[model samples]
Target: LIVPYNLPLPGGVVPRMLITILGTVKPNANRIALDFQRGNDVAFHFNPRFNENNRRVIVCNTKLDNNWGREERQSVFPFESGKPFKIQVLVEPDHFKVAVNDAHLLQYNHRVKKLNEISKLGISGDIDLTSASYTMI
Candidate 1:
């Protein structure tokens, strides 16, 4: 079951976002992406791969200057099929910190110095949300 919900923030830790989604991992699922988007520039890219010996690994990365930066993978699979999860991402002067299930998960540094530029949150999948984030504009 794939449940789609809108978590529009019309934006910080409190205002930065509050989002949730419900979906079963496709029996033959391969990969999916959770994106924090503004226009076409993706602020944060959260990807989960369920195949290729990657048993529910989470990959986090960012992009800038038309080039994708390094990848940060550290959130050990706290997700399961049809499980309800709450992820909170906060923006600081240094990085964007993400907490999944009320526990600290991962961080992505500022590729775009101005966090306020992000004005839209969107989703695309075999995945659930193509993008999930709050807007500060």
Candidate 2:
């Protein structure tokens, strides 16, 4: 299951990006990926997996130069099946800060340092994104 989010960045400028994803995690879902992409690169890749342990697992990383960075998995996971949630991605100069249900979850440092080049957002896997938006600074 994949959802392509298309709210373009005018003039290729997004200084302080705040992405909001309001949706439900399906009961049978393995995970969901919210990728902040620029051409062939994914600056911030956010994925959350559901399991029997109630672990609330989250994995954050970046892909650049045909290489993936070390995974950042040490974050709070608070995902519930068949329930609505607000997943937020706040972009700063140095990194991207992620939050789930208004609680800080993790951060993925920028590999694509040029924020203006990140022109799109794509989300996928077992969730209905009600809305996704960003503000330019």
Candidate 3:
């Protein structure tokens, strides 16, 4: 399932975007996955840049087992800034296949049991988020 929207994004630029899949997961699951790719010469920059390296990209997945338990998370791959990129996410039970610009960048995984446990999905950065969609495959 792909969810496409043309609503005015927080950013003022318009770019082609798509989100591959979307699904809910339980809070107790072990892991989740995200696959993505980039198309243009721009990098998908995440909020709160953690490193000084310009060749870094961020991909993440998290699992919630308990209200107070530590979250499970992971990050994959890295790329130079000001370059085109793409990536794909393989989420078990629920998967996210994402592409940016035209190149492939990162894949992420999250673990949860119930679908309702998923409260939000977001991509924030300096890159242009033209259009986006989500699906559950």
Candidate 4:
């Protein structure tokens, strides 16, 4: 996979669907983002920032018509610069459950409502991607 990768969701997001991203953050990486979008609207924005006031934080939010909504932040920072990481996003009926390096990270509730409307997934920023794939179970 490429650093800035974009792929259409083959069957959209359905309950029990699992999306996985494997990558290694660059030594001087500043940030990385994974976005689920419906046309121009962002259904889910998962961003990990390394330069936030000298601390690392993962921010989650939604955007509609270019306007971003409230951000969700947690105390845990499971990613490391220059280290490999495995990120898994499990789609449920009510929320998206995220895990990093096999550890439970956070959850983002469904804001857009219609899961099938999120037809695209985009990944970008300073990282070397090994693979990005999704499966249903």
Largest lDDT belongs to which candidate?
A: 4
User: Per-residue lDDT tens digits of candidate 3, residues 1-137?
Assistant: 23221222232112222334223322322222331212211112122232425432343434232222232222443333443334333333343333443445443232333333233344434333333343334
Cα-based TM-score, every candidate: 0.67, 0.83, 0.37, 0.97
Model 3: what TM-score? 0.37
What tens-digit string does per-residue lDDT give for candidate 1 at 1-137?
23233344443133344454434454565665666665567778877776547556888777665667788786477655544455566666677776777888777776655566665444434544433444332
Candidate 4 lDDT at 43 equals: 97
Clashes of each: 7, 0, 57, 0
Per-residue lDDT of model 4, residues 15-117, tens digit only: 9999999989999999999999988999999999998998888899999999999999976998889999999999999999999999999999999988988
Where is model 2 poorest over a 10-residue stretch in terms of lDDT? 1-10
Among all candidates shown, the one with the greatest TM-score: 4
Tally clashing residue pairs in candidate 1.
7
Clashing pairs in 4: none
Model 3 score (lDDT): 0.32
